[PDB]
Each structure stands twice: as C-alpha cells, then as structure tokens.
C-alpha cells in the first residue's frame, strides 16, 4: 500500500529536530534586534511564538501604551510590559528596520504553525503504518525508535530487552567493559507511562512497557491483514495500566 514508507517517517523525524534547532536560533536573532531596541520583553517572557506575536501586534512603546494584548499574554505580564514601555531603556528605531522585524516575526509564526502541522502529519502517518505502537507508547518515541535502529523489520527482529535498552548504548558498553551497573531506561524515558510512574517503579514499568511494546511491534510489522485499529495495542495498554496501578498502590512504609 502507498502509505507504508518508513523512509519518509525517518526523514520526518530528522527534519523535526532540525526545525526546532533553527527555530531556536531564529528567535535568538529576533530577540537580539528587539533587544537593541527594548529588552524587558526578552527578560520577562522567553517563549518564542508569544514574543514574536507581540512584535507583530505592537511596534513601538507608544503603540504598546495604546494597544491591548489580552489573547497573546495574560494581563499582568501585559501591563508589566506596558510599564516597561512607559519607562524603557531604549531608543526609537527606524521605519525600514521596523519593517524587517515585522517580516521576521511573520517568519517565526509561520515556522511554529508549520512545525505543528508537520507533527500532525507525523502522528497521522504513524497511526497509518504502525498503529498498535502509536496506541501504546507514543508516536514521538515510536519514530525515534525506528529512526535509531533503522527500519521496521529489523526493529521487529530484535528482542525485548534490547528494546528496553535501545538508547543509552554508550553508557551500556562503557559499563559492561568496566563491569558496573547496566543502565535501565535508555530511550523509553520519554513515554507517558514512565512519566506516570516514579523510581524503582520506573525501572519495572520500563521493562514491562518494552515487553508489551515488543508484542505490539512484532504483531504490527509482520501481519498479513492488519485491522488498522489497534485492539492489541489497547489491551496491552490496559494490562500496563493494571500493572502500574498495582505497583504504585503497593506500600513500602508500614501500616
């Protein structure tokens, strides 16, 4: 079927990390220009999309005293910015340079919505190719798994304890060559389930999640008639919920 293309999925994840990196440095450049103008914005807020939308909205401190900024930022931060506009440390900046800052903030908003759209494409395509995995573990870490170890069938060929490892291979091989403790989580730290758990429970949830994920993966990549819903994924999730609930409900301090 013309929807099953792992090379497009791995191109997507590589593109995703690069896009985040370049968005960060572009927001840096915008911050530096409007810090040659007026820096208290850059010292109060840091979130790039909101900062750039302020730049799109108002363009000078008098305009800021004129304008309202309710929907971009909460109002106490808004009025603190207004007080900074009323007592700035800044110059006034020329017309053409105002135009260029406007064009740059337009670029930033476009990249942010673009990245959200690309993540939408990634998630829908993930559910199209390997649905049980997306029901169980999360599409971000799913793409990252396939991207680290190559492609679908090879990731299926490898077994469960390896899947619990996959990430921290450097720490692994150093630890085994120096005879120390093996690492437990590796890459599966970024799952919502391990985010629910805590501590030694995180270790146990890590191996359990890797195992049921390995069942999901082997059923997912090597089946003839995949229903494309993921009931196997859902049942693995339910059993994982039972296990996590019981292990968190178990008490350690005496009663």
């Amino acid at each position: 079927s013309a929807d099953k293309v792992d090379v497009m999925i791995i191109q997507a994840i590589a593109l995703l990390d690069d896009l985040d990196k370049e968005l960060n440095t572009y927001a840096m450049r915008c911050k530096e220009w409007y810090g040659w103008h007026f820096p208290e914005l850059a010292k109060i807020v840091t979130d790039s999309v909101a900062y750039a939308r302020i730049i799109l909205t108002m363009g000078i401190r008098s305009k800021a005293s004129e304008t309202d900024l309710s929907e971009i930022l909460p109002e106490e931060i808004e009025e603190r910015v207004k007080t900074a506009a009323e007592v700035s440390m800044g110059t006034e900046i020329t017309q053409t340079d105002l135009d260029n800052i406007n064009a740059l903030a337009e670029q930033i908003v476009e990249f942010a919505a673009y990245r959200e759209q690309l993540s939408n494409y990634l998630s829908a395509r993930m559910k199209a190719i390997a649905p049980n995995l997306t029901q169980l573990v999360g599409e971000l870490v799913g793409a990252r798994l396939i991207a680290h170890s190559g492609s679908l069938i090879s990731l299926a060929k490898s077994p469960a304890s390896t899947i619990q490892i996959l990430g921290a291979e450097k720490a692994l091989f150093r630890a085994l060559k120096t005879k120390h403790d093996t690492p437990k989580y590796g890459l599966l730290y970024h799952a919502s389930l391990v985010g629910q758990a805590t501590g030694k429970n995180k270790g146990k949830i890590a191996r359990v999640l890797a195992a049921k994920a390995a069942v999901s993966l082997r059923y997912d990549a090597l089946a003839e008639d995949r229903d494309d819903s993921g009931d196997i994924g859902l049942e693995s999730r339910a059993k994982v919920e039972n296990r996590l609930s019981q292990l968190e409900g178990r008490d350690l301090r005496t009663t």
Partner: protein
C-alpha cells in the same frame, strides 16, 4: 596560554572573582553577556548542569586594568561585593567598567561617570548590551549637576588623573556614599605632580583624605605591572575617625 587547553576554576577569597588554574595561572570573572569579547580578550567557557547550559568566564587583563593589580597584588578587603552598588569615577571604557559589572553581578548596579564624548559613545553602546551599567556623561566635579540620578551608592572607585583628586573624591563621597562605606583610589604621581617624589605625593594625598574624614585602611604599590602607582583602600566613617 594557547586557545585550546583545559583549565580548572576556583572561588577566591573575594567573592565573584575566580582563579583559572591550568599550566599557568589567570584571574577570571563570570560574564553576563555571553560569547561577546569586548577588547579581544581570550575567554573560557564551561557547561553547567534540563540539559546543561553554557556559561562563560573572562580573563581580567592585568597589564591593562588599573584594578587588576589590586587582586593579584592582594588587598585585604575589597568592598565590591556581589550585591552592592558601585560608583565609578572615570570609566574609560569597557576595559574596566564591564569587569566591575561582572563582579557586581546581576542584582547590583554600576554607575559609570565620564565626560569625554566618544568614550561616551562606546559606553552607551556597551550598556545597551549589558543591563546593569548606567552611564552618565558629565564632569566628575559637579554632583550638584547630576544629583537626580544616583541613589545612595555603596562603594566608590576612582581613577581620574586630574590634580583635583582628593577634592573630587571628597565631594562625590560626601554626596552619595553610605555611612561606613568603602573607597578605592588609583593614584598616579606623574599626573598629580612631577618634581616632588612619588611616595611624598602619596603621603600628601592620604593626609588630604584623612582631613576629608575618610580613614585609610591600607595601600598597595602595584609594582610588577606598572611603575609608580598606588591603590588606596579606605573607609568613609564620617563620625569619629579615631
């Protein structure tokens, strides 16, 4: 030495200032404005653990700053602290004012006060980069000209070369200095008077300050870097010098 070696940092007796030890030794401080070199000075940087963020430290040029000899020569107590406010009579440029901003850190403030315009241009652009430094471009003999801009500063530094030195430090200290305050002077014999000897000029000036109700704790000669100076560290007491 070269731009590649690995070195170890160390907190000093004075706060803020750190020792950079490697094969050779250096005096270093923490930089607020990252990645930017002011006057071509070689800079160290470290990772620090969120992933670790990168902070940057800067060498304090001992042949160039007329305060650098203070710490290397070793003053018993420098009143510049990581929370106080410093009045600065005679910021030539970043060459010292940026470093005093870096040792006083984020919460503190520094008032640069200077008169000649083009250093004023470099000053204001540098403050435009770094937000704890406020420059004032007026003559250093009239705090009555600029008395709306400074509120109760904690320690005064001065490196002016004009012959008015004792009187102008007396004026600015009596205006804006806190009681039990600190004062640091960098005095040059050639720019006060030539024919009489340097140490006699030193005695004359320290006697002038004792007349102006600032009791001197100690002096340093700063021999190995520049010839014939003194750094005087004293205390504004205002009430019973004895």
């Amino acid at each position: 030495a070269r731009g590649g070696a690995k070195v170890v940092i160390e907190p000093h007796r004075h706060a803020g200032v750190y020792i950079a030890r490697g094969k050779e030794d250096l005096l270093v401080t923490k930089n607020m404005a990252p990645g930017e070199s002011v006057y071509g000075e070689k800079r160290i940087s470290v990772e620090e653990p969120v992933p670790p963020t990168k902070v940057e430290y800067r060498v304090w040029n001992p042949f160039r700053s007329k305060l650098a000899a203070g710490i290397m020569g070793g003053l018993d107590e420098l009143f510049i602290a990581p929370g106080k406010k410093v009045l600065y009579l005679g910021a030539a440029s970043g060459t010292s004012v940026s470093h005093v901003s870096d040792v006083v850190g984020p919460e503190g403030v520094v008032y640069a006060v200077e008169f000649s315009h083009r250093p004023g241009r470099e000053l204001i652009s540098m403050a435009k980069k770094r937000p704890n430094i406020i420059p004032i471009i007026e003559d250093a003999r009239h705090p009555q000209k600029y008395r709306m801009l400074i509120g109760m500063v904690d320690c005064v530094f001065a490196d002016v070369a004009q012959p008015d030195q004792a009187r102008i430090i007396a004026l600015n200290s009596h205006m804006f200095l806190k009681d039990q305050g600190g004062v640091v002077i960098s005095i040059k014999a050639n720019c006060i008077d030539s024919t009489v000897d340097a140490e006699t000029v030193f005695a004359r000036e320290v006697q002038k300050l004792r007349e102006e109700r600032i009791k001197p704790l100690e002096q340093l000669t700063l021999e190995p870097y520049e010839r014939d100076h003194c750094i005087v560290v004293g205390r504004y007491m205002r009430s019973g010098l004895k």
